[model samples]
Target: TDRDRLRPPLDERSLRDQLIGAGSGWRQLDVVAQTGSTNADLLARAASGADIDGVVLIAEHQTAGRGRHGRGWAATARAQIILSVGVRVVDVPVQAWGWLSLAAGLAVLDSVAPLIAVPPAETGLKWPNDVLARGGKLAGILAEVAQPFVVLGVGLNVTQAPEEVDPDATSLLDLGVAAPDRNRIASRLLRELEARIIQWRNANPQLAADYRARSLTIGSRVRVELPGGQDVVGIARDIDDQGRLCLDVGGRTVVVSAGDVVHLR
Candidate 1:
């Protein structure tokens, strides 16, 4: 198992102690050696009539990881951060819930920006919920609502080998990071997430401003693939107050709540 041992596991005890010791809002934090999906696990608990709000679930090796639009997200064991947290839907306004993922993307940026050796301008968020660095996708965020509880999952590639990750994707190692610290990354991620969620719940104006400044989608030519299999081509104008994408299509403004965005220029 030397190959598997190349990537070390997370320090659950220290993480729990430090995160909770700081008076964090996280009620419970558990790191499992392996799991099907952290998000799925928390959602299942919520479905069983359990209140899983403030619970953080992490998996060292997630065999069946998932991304937006039901896409399969594969990550090598211990080579990335697989984390999910449960929050009550009622905690945030129903309309503002759409901003949660964008806010999370900002948190991911905040947590990883210091670790990467690249210029700060090179790192930013892809609309909806994605972290981009070195012109590649570095992380993905998926937010799913399970009635009273909403589970947000974040998958961040850390010390993955160059060959182990997709050519179009990137990790800390690929970004000139010699040794990536998962423990530190996890802690900062959770902390940043908590703060970002609070901003979302309060409808903070800074949330929109920060998101706009760090967004790579806005002010670009984009093609949004809708769930109904239709494509809308336009220039990304801005993110509305409710977090929808505002696009300028042929001098007309179009707003999209859900879709796959591909930047053309």
Candidate 2:
């Protein structure tokens, strides 16, 4: 099978050693030349009862990738940070599961923010799981649960061309910054993500604080479309302890646990 090559070739042995190092903590680390979707593969593995916990899968060229709400992701091979991890949340309550995506978003945000040309604070989150760079969509996060494990998927626009993304999108190449090697970025992300995962495993208190400090949707005027076909236009309020998007609709405050949000200035 011929794989498309563009960016600097990633050092697989170095990455594998870095992530599943020493005596090993994650189940396994596998890098593929191509895949339909890392999330799909990881979720299936989790469902098969094969003790897939701690497995990390990376795809160099993801032909069939998706974002939240089933949106397709388009990027040249190796132009994005695309991978998935398999793990279960045993410390947080089932009710707090809503925050896991946000937690993942925070992890990605922390990982990629330093690479931005602008201030790191310029990198913030668009509710639920979007990482924004200077108001442009930079990355996305998705979490799929198969009973005990949640397959976490992440996609970052590292060196995509303008036509490959939305007008509200930008990448490391687009920002005029030298593209950091894919393997380097991946290593940094997994390291930060480990912290967030630990937090998720212990009902992390700093989770909310860290997220709030970087959230872009908290005080913005917005419209949240709930999964049930209802819409609410309101001023964004504080995030509750459960990581719900708090909205001040007129007089009453509404807590949104799930939905599509549009940032309306």
Q: Judge candidate 2 at residue 228 and give its lDDT.
A: 70
RMSD of each: 1.9, 2.8
Stretches of candidate 2 above 4 Å error?
1-6, 120-122
Cα lDDT of candidate 1 equals 0.86
Report the C-alpha lDDT of model 2 over 102-140, residue by residue, as the tens digit.
888999888877776666335689898888876677888
Can you give the TM-score per candidate against the true fold? 0.94, 0.92
Worst 10 residues of 1 by lDDT: 114-123
The TM-score measured for candidate 2 stands at: 0.92
Question: On a 0 to 100 scale, what is the lDDT of residue 33 in model 1?
Answer: 92
Structure candidate 1, residue pairs in collision: none
Clashing pairs in 2: 27-54
